[PDB]
Amino acid sequence: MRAVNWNKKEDDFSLMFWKQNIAQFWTEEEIAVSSDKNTWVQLSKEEQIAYKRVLGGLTLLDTKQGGEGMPLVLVHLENLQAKSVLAFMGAMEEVHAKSYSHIFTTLATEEEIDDIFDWVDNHPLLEKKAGIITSYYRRLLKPEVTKKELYMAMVASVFLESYLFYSGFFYPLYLAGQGKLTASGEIINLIIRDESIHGVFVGILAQQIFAELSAEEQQEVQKETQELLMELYEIEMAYTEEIYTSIGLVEDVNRFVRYNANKGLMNLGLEPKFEEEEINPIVLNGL
Amino acid sequence: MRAVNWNKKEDDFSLMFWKQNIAQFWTEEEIAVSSDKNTWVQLSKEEQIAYKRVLGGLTLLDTKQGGEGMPLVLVHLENLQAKSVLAFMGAMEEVHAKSYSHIFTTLATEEEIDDIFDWVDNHPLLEKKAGIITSYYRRLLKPEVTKKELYMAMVASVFLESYLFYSGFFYPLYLAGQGKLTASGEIINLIIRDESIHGVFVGILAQQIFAELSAEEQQEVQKETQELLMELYEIEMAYTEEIYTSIGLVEDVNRFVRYNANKGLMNLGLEPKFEEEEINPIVLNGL
Ligand SMILES: [Fe+2]
Ligand SMILES: [Fe+2]
Ligand SMILES: [Fe+2]
Ligand SMILES: [Fe+2]
């Protein structure tokens, strides 16, 4: 049986990613959020609700990426150095998920936090999109998987990492770029710094497997990716209408969604699908 | 679909272990090992070979614990906070494995390192024990597992963490407790500080599942654990004879093996199997 040997390269890139992943290492203890109370308490009812909801949503998605997505993809790779990077990424998903609880503990009462988690567990849209993504991961729960299965699990992973979070991320970034909830904003920026590299790394791996597919499998996977994209888009349009209509930001978030979906596509070596618009400069500022 | 909520306990212990795991965080870059060259050159060739070999052995076992053991156990837990801790542990298995390469890069030439990993990959006793352990993990590569299967994968995990490493750990500790290879020794001590807690944590989880088994499944799992224990032992005794006969330390290491096997059992809430015997104070000093 092979042990990992980092003195002999298995590829051109895993070492650089391992180094960057660990250079970016953080834990929630390192950001105090209590100074955010002062801006929190001046937001409207509707603004507090939107924030809590989107954070609740992100928590779920990181829960799944750490508990299913990373582990199941890594177990089937034969590249042991690439494997190592994914296992580190997986741990960091759990830091991410935990960091949202760190934000809640300072902003919300014990009863308000039970409220948010009851809403997230009962949410039909969060269930659907998490369900769609997680369906590709769960196919990997068997001894030998095909390369088409592995590839599609990786496509779902990058969709999740580079695309699905950003209807959520939008709002902590909008608030931070106005000087509100900046301590929480720093956390979301640390999360996002991780996800950016997650997405790129899994996308490189996906492209290696794509190259190992027959021409006809290549065409199938292309079709399926495009369908998956539009399926998810529909659900993100519903999500975003639900969350943001109360605070008049629907179209701003939608632009951001499309922008991020194109980044997801690009990480997978695919062409952009949405025409590029101006992202709201106040979110850019929060970035 | 549930998101992890750390403001509401899922158990009595996961939070404390999550905190201790992340408080013990380290990477190889924090320990310079070049100062070890001076003592290295003064060891006999038999001593160097024994060190390189055991390190090679440890690298393999960590490779498998990070790439199969932690991921496969964590996917089938329903306790999301417990799941978090395992994912962090999994990442740390990768740090550990990488750390042995950091040591080799200082102490051995590129051609000498290719040598050790050739020996590792071809080793019939490393293949057997890693094979045995890993057979319980691979059982989890299906959509639904039984509690008996999960429990046994956890037993194997503890046996790996609390028992199978220590025929290897012995020798870096022996050398360090004499002032030799002390920088490498600090690395092993960091590794061992992690593995102590790994073993205790996985053992708590196993005991929970044991309580959920019928009386008859409890009896089966007991018979199988005892057999697995003895199967491994006969392999470790062959291993220790191979490695350590050249430097006269066979029986010392064997006493340490049995000692650590009793710790493994204890972590699982089972009774000790081996009579207690004086462990070498020099290794205790390296601890
Ligand atoms: Fe994440
Ligand atoms: Fe991620
Ligand atoms: Fe380890
Ligand atoms: Fe471990």
Side-chain angles (χ1 to χ4, degrees):
Chain A
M1 331 220 328
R2 310 157 48 210
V4 191
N5 174 12
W6 284 98
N7 288 106
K8 195 53 65 58
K9 288 194 215 314
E10 280 180 82
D11 55 50
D12 271 356
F13 54 89
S14 288
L15 182 56
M16 168 180 54
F17 279 87
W18 169 272
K19 284 153 94 94
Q20 189 69 200
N21 276 279
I22 85 83
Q24 291 180 8
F25 179 73
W26 61 282
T27 139
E28 58 200 49
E29 273 318 297
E30 96 194 51
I31 306 116
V33 166
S34 55
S35 69
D36 276 8
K37 263 230 95 80
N38 301 109
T39 39
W40 175 248
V41 83
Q42 292 177 64
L43 291 178
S44 74
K45 177 94 270 142
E46 290 95 324
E47 292 172 325
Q48 293 191 353
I49 287 157
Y51 198 81
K52 284 188 285 184
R53 283 181 181 167
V54 294
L55 262 51
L58 305 184
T59 302
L60 178 66
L61 297 174
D62 271 310
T63 296
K64 290 277 118 160
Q65 192 72 338
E68 309 192 349
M70 288 310 71
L72 291 179
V73 173
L74 78 84
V75 70
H76 291 289
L77 293 182
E78 299 206 62
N79 182 333
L80 303 177
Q81 288 170 7
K83 205 167 203 99
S84 306
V85 173
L86 265 17
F88 194 86
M89 291 172 34
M92 290 296 93
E93 308 303 337
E94 300 297 353
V95 175
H96 300 171
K98 197 171 189 296
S99 72
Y100 307 121
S101 283
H102 184 62
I103 301 165
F104 298 153
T105 186
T106 84
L107 292 176
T109 64
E110 314 195 92
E111 225 206 330
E112 267 181 276
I113 298 149
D114 300 312
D115 171 78
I116 298 156
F117 281 85
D118 207 321
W119 179 87
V120 359
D121 197 4
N122 291 138
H123 207 274
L125 301 177
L126 287 180
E127 156 116 79
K128 255 219 295 266
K129 71 179 141 190
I132 294 182
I133 290 295
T134 272
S135 75
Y136 290 94
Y137 300 162
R138 291 174 161 159
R139 305 204 77 197
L140 300 182
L141 251 1
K142 64 198 178 190
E144 82 191 339
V145 302
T146 61
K147 262 85 312 206
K148 168 155 187 266
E149 283 173 323
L150 186 50
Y151 179 73
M152 287 302 304
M154 281 167 186
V155 163
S157 183
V158 336
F159 280 171
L160 184 160
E161 307 282 61
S162 308
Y163 160 36
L164 298 187
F165 284 121
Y166 287 88
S167 57
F169 289 150
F170 176 96
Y171 195 50
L173 295 176
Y174 189 74
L175 296 178
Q178 304 174 237
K180 302 157 153 144
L181 304 193
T182 54
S184 282
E186 262 176 12
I187 297 186
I188 293 342
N189 279 109
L190 290 177
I191 294 184
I192 280 159
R193 191 177 66 179
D194 292 339
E195 291 314 322
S196 171
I197 61 148
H198 291 195
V200 169
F201 185 71
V202 174
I204 287 151
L205 300 180
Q207 297 175 66
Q208 290 187 316
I209 298 146
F210 187 82
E212 299 175 359
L213 306 173
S214 76
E216 51 258 43
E217 285 176 310
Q218 285 178 4
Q219 306 306 32
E220 294 163 30
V221 108
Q222 289 278 15
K223 183 48 35 106
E224 195 182 351
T225 298
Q226 289 300 333
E227 287 170 290
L228 171 60
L229 175 70
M230 287 302 101
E231 220 341 319
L232 291 168
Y233 184 74
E234 266 198 84
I235 109 111
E236 288 299 282
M237 293 308 92
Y239 189 57
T240 229
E241 181 144 65
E242 188 182 267
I243 297 310
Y244 292 101
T245 62
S246 58
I247 59 175
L249 294 167
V250 172
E251 191 56 49
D252 299 281
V253 185
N254 293 160
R255 289 172 196 124
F256 199 49
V257 164
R258 292 191 285 265
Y259 178 80
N260 284 283
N262 288 347
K263 293 197 84 190
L265 287 161
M266 283 175 329
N267 289 343
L268 286 163
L270 310 176
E271 298 319 298
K273 233 213 96 113
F274 298 107
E275 327 324 323
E276 211 107 286
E277 318 105 8
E278 227 218 327
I279 164 244
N280 189 310
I282 113 92
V283 26
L284 257 163
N285 176 209
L287 276 168
Chain B
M1 208 175 306
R2 310 156 49 209
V4 68
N5 171 14
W6 285 96
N7 289 107
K8 195 175 73 129
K9 287 195 215 313
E10 284 180 80
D11 59 54
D12 287 352
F13 54 84
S14 288
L15 181 57
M16 170 179 185
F17 277 85
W18 169 274
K19 287 153 93 94
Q20 186 75 20
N21 277 85
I22 87 83
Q24 292 177 11
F25 182 74
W26 61 283
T27 66
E28 60 190 50
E29 296 189 332
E30 299 155 53
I31 305 121
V33 299
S34 56
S35 298
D36 278 4
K37 263 188 107 79
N38 150 231
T39 38
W40 176 247
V41 302
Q42 298 210 258
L43 278 32
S44 72
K45 244 60 181 26
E46 292 93 341
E47 291 171 325
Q48 292 188 3
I49 284 156
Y51 200 84
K52 284 189 283 184
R53 285 181 181 167
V54 296
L55 260 51
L58 306 184
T59 302
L60 178 67
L61 298 173
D62 278 293
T63 297
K64 293 290 174 160
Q65 192 71 340
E68 306 196 338
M70 283 312 157
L72 289 179
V73 174
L74 77 83
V75 303
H76 293 288
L77 295 183
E78 300 213 24
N79 181 334
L80 301 176
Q81 287 172 5
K83 200 169 273 262
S84 308
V85 174
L86 292 175
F88 194 87
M89 291 174 158
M92 294 296 92
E93 307 303 338
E94 303 297 354
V95 173
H96 297 174
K98 197 170 187 296
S99 279
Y100 308 122
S101 281
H102 185 64
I103 299 165
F104 295 153
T105 102
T106 284
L107 294 177
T109 64
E110 312 202 308
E111 297 142 67
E112 278 157 8
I113 298 148
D114 298 315
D115 284 353
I116 122 154
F117 280 88
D118 247 289
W119 180 90
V120 166
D121 200 6
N122 280 78
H123 207 278
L125 305 177
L126 292 179
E127 219 140 14
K128 266 176 150 232
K129 73 179 142 191
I132 294 180
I133 288 296
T134 270
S135 71
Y136 291 86
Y137 297 159
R138 288 193 110 248
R139 208 89 184 135
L140 300 182
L141 268 176
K142 65 198 179 189
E144 312 152 313
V145 302
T146 61
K147 302 220 199 201
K148 166 156 187 266
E149 282 173 325
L150 184 54
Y151 179 72
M152 286 303 304
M154 282 169 187
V155 164
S157 187
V158 166
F159 281 170
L160 184 160
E161 312 196 287
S162 305
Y163 162 31
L164 299 189
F165 287 120
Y166 285 80
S167 57
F169 287 149
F170 178 96
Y171 196 49
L173 292 177
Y174 187 77
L175 295 178
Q178 300 170 351
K180 297 203 144 144
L181 305 194
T182 50
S184 136
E186 266 160 4
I187 296 188
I188 276 49
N189 276 116
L190 290 177
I191 293 183
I192 279 158
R193 189 178 67 179
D194 291 344
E195 291 311 324
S196 306
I197 286 142
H198 290 197
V200 168
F201 185 68
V202 174
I204 289 150
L205 300 182
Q207 295 174 61
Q208 291 183 329
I209 295 146
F210 188 83
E212 298 175 22
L213 303 173
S214 77
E216 175 152 30
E217 284 177 308
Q218 288 175 192
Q219 319 249 40
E220 294 170 40
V221 109
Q222 290 277 76
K223 297 177 187 180
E224 199 182 351
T225 298
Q226 290 302 329
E227 182 163 287
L228 170 58
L229 173 70
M230 292 315 295
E231 215 87 54
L232 292 166
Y233 184 69
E234 103 167 81
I235 294 164
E236 285 297 285
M237 295 313 243
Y239 190 57
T240 55
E241 183 134 289
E242 190 176 312
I243 299 310
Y244 292 99
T245 59
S246 58
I247 57 175
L249 294 168
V250 173
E251 189 58 49
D252 271 0
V253 185
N254 292 160
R255 290 171 197 123
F256 201 49
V257 164
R258 289 190 285 266
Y259 176 78
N260 277 286
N262 288 347
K263 293 196 85 189
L265 286 161
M266 284 175 328
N267 293 337
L268 286 163
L270 283 7
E271 84 168 310
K273 243 61 225 178
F274 296 109
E275 191 83 287
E276 298 221 276
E277 45 225 301
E278 283 161 283
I279 63 172
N280 196 125
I282 304 153
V283 288
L284 276 167
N285 178 37
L287 212 61

